[PDB]
Structure formats: structure tokens, C-alpha cells
Amino acid sequence: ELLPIELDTLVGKGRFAEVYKAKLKQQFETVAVKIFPYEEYASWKTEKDIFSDINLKHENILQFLTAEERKTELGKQYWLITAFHAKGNLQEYLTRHVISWEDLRKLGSSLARGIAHLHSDHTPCGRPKMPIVHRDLKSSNILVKNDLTCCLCDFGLSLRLDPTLSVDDLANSGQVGTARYMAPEVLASAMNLENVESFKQTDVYSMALVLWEMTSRCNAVGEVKDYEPPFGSKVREHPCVASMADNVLADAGRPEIPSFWLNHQGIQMVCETLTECWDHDPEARLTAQCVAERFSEL
């Protein structure tokens, strides 16, 4: 019943699981194996349920193969088998490479399309579908495909906006995610729980920081500095919510957009788009769909 898989190399370690480059015996196909210990069964079930939905299928969402339960000598493991993207995550890609305007346009539009798709109540063909909020969107969580387009993948903290969700259930999760990428209303514990979609606006803010990281490493601006994560020099390596709130909320701080970047007409449209997306007011932000339309115009 189990797939003939040989694990090769540990390529990543998340909060809930390890990721291995692996060989699937067919000749062989290269796949990624996400391995959860018994203790993280709930995160494995969450991702499996998200990936199992036939309506999720999209070019900017990681391709799911199967979920497996694997007995070991000293216990049991829970596996998620997915496509492998050799270029790795976007944060390491941006650290190592200076990108072109064409690359930025491809990465930026594909990210917005992937997020607009997750948030949508319909598939691209109009079939009803469960909206999903990512909740831990960041450059280290986005995969770079061989054609230099984004691929969303890490759904352990993601929330299916199920109509049966209670107000007490929505607050039960607490402050989930990475503090560096947390929207000001998330840092403030000021999330409007009377309406789910306030969750969609938090994904749009995190996406705006990712679009900034991409722009910051694009040669089209002219002079490109070394990669630094958003608010890199203002806070400690693994910042607490309090130090992030001092910057994002109290100091109204956003990653720096030097004026010379706006000399290029393309970078200008990008910088204006991501600026609306990181507004203090979640209701003043563009939707991921608005952002994808802006990229489809450029």
C-alpha cells in the first residue's frame, strides 16, 4: 500500500515537520516528503485536508501526491508526498540572486494569483470552493518553480473559512504565525472577528512584505543592496510580537522604499501596489485579486 520511496537529503525543518528530497520508484521521480512526528498529527491532518480538496488545484499551489502513515521501529510517522521544486524557497533564492524585471513580474504576479485563488469562493472555472487563509505567509514559505513562478506550500497554520466556524473558535487559535510578517491588527490583537475576510486582509499585508523583498533584489531599480528580511536591522533575529508592534503599530514602520526605485515605471507601479497592501487599515488594502489584475495589466 505504501509508495516505493527512498529518502535522500534533509532539505528543510519547519515548526511541525522535516522535509526531505526523495526518490519515488516508477526509473525514478524526485519528490518532496514532509514528515510529521505523532505529536504533530493535527498539523498533518490540517494540511492533508487542505491538499485533499480537488478545488485547491492551481499552478501556484504545491502539487500534492498522497498522505501516508508509516510505522517505524520506535513509533510512527505521518507523511505528505508532494512535488519537489529544486530551486527551493524564495527567501534563499533572493538571498543568492539579483533578479530582473521579467523575474519580478513573474514571481509577483504568480504570488498574487496563488493567494487570490486560496481566498476565492470559486475555482478559476466558477465552481464553488472553500476559501482558505494561509496565515503564515513569508518568503521562506514560498517555493520557486523552475520557470521562476511562485508556489505556495506550507498550510499547517492555514484556516479553511468553514461556515461552521464560531467566534470563540476563531479566537481559539490566538496570535498564530511569524511575528515579523504579522499585520498591525494581528500584532495589536485587534482583529475584527465579526467577519472572516479580516483574515484575508492579514494575508494581503504579509504578501505586501514579500513583494517588497522581491522588489528590493530586482536589478531594474539600478543599485541593489544585499538581501535583508523586512525590518531586518530594526529588530532581533527571531522577534517577539512586542518588538514588532513597537515598529509596525507604534512607529508606523514599513520596509524602506528609496525614492530612486520609482525612476523605473514598472518598479513604481509595484511599489504603489504593495504600499496600499500594507496600509494600517485592513479595509484600505487591495485584495489579492486586485494585485493580480495590476500585474496582468503590467
The total number of structural domains in the chain stands at 2
Active site residues: 136
Domain CATH for 233: 1.10.510.10
Method for structure elucidation: X-ray
Same domain, 81 and 93: no
Is 75 annotated in a binding site? The answer is no
- The answer on 92 and 77 residing in a single domain is no
* Domain identity same for 208 and 123: yes
Burial 88-107 (b: 16+ CB within 10 A, else e): ebbbebbeeeebebebbbbb
Same domain, 6 and 106: no
Calculate the CA 8 to chain-centre distance.
25
- Residue 138 labeled ligand binder: no
Q: What is the rounded distance in angstroms from the CA atom of residue 52 to the CA atom of residue 137?
A: 20
- Structural domain boundaries, residue 131: 87-298
Does the annotation list 71 as a binding residue? no
Best CA proximity match to 78, nearest among 30, 29, 43: 43
Strand 76-83 to 28-37 pairing: antiparallel
CATH number of 58's domain:
3.30.200.20
17 is in an annotated binding site: yes
Residues 255 and 297 in one domain: yes
Q: Could you tell me if 145 and 261 lie in one domain?
A: yes
